[PDB]
Amino acid sequence: MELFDENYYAKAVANIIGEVKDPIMYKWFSPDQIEDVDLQMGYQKTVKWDAFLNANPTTIANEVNTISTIGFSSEVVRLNYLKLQYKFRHLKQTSEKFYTSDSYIGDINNNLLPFAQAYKLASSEIIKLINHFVLTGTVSIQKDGKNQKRLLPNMYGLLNMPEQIKEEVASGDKDKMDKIFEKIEAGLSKLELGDEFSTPMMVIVDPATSLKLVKPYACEKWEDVLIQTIKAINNREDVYIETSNLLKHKILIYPLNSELIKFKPSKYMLPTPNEQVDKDSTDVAHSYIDFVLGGLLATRKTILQVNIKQS
């Protein structure tokens, strides 16, 4: 600390608040795959209608009244949605003229901020948490991933969706890209796209997997070989590769087709302020933010999840 009036030389003040940006989960879905629904909490049932041919068509020659038939079928799927809330403290609106100068926004000593800035920061944090839930299917605030919040049934993410293809790379081959690629080939062979195979594909990997991929193939790269392998099965359409720090020794492969994978989030999934505001005789007030989780829908055996066991 300087013993002279150093505050005199503080002739410029810049405050970094950021801005509520678009969630990064939008990059993992096509524009057609996302469709909002009107719900806050509970379950919603979606019915898929289907048709099939019972026999060969009938030739219309001379007189005939016995024609082949076309049958129909239905399937009911139930999706659960959960409502969650967070609380944050902020300055009361009438105290801003006393707690805010031209070179200040709030109490630096007490970390007290006005409602707009506090809401923006909280919204950013909640959007990050929502992105983590969508990518992983679990809710946690620890880097270890433990202390997970128990969730409702029929609430899954891409990583933990049941009835999908799961491959495991043994701890003895955790650093063998050849073994990893063999497992990936097995999963791709077990993939079942049916008549919707002509679709773009998306791959999500962890930084260690990306580092291994950019290595030369054992002058070609493992990434190029994987792209060619995926193009072999997706009718040689676009294959996108992404890296996320939220994953750990996991590889996710899935198509960007609405006929197989859909996202029906609640129209209140993103953070929304609550009407209740706690007030008292002091200058500190509290506010609440609501958000809704759930809504991922997938067909059977259309997602490949590879886990590289570390030990």
Binding site: P31, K267, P273
Partner: peptide, 28 residues
């Protein structure tokens, strides 16, 4: 917005419009 319900609906519509704009401006 007349009331909080309309305010929430406006927020949801703004979020939807932002998502649509992001997907329109996205180039892979």
């Amino acid at each position: 917005p007349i009331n909080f319900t309309e305010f929430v609906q406006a927020i949801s519509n703004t979020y939807k419009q932002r998502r649509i704009q992001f997907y329109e401006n996205l180039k892979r």
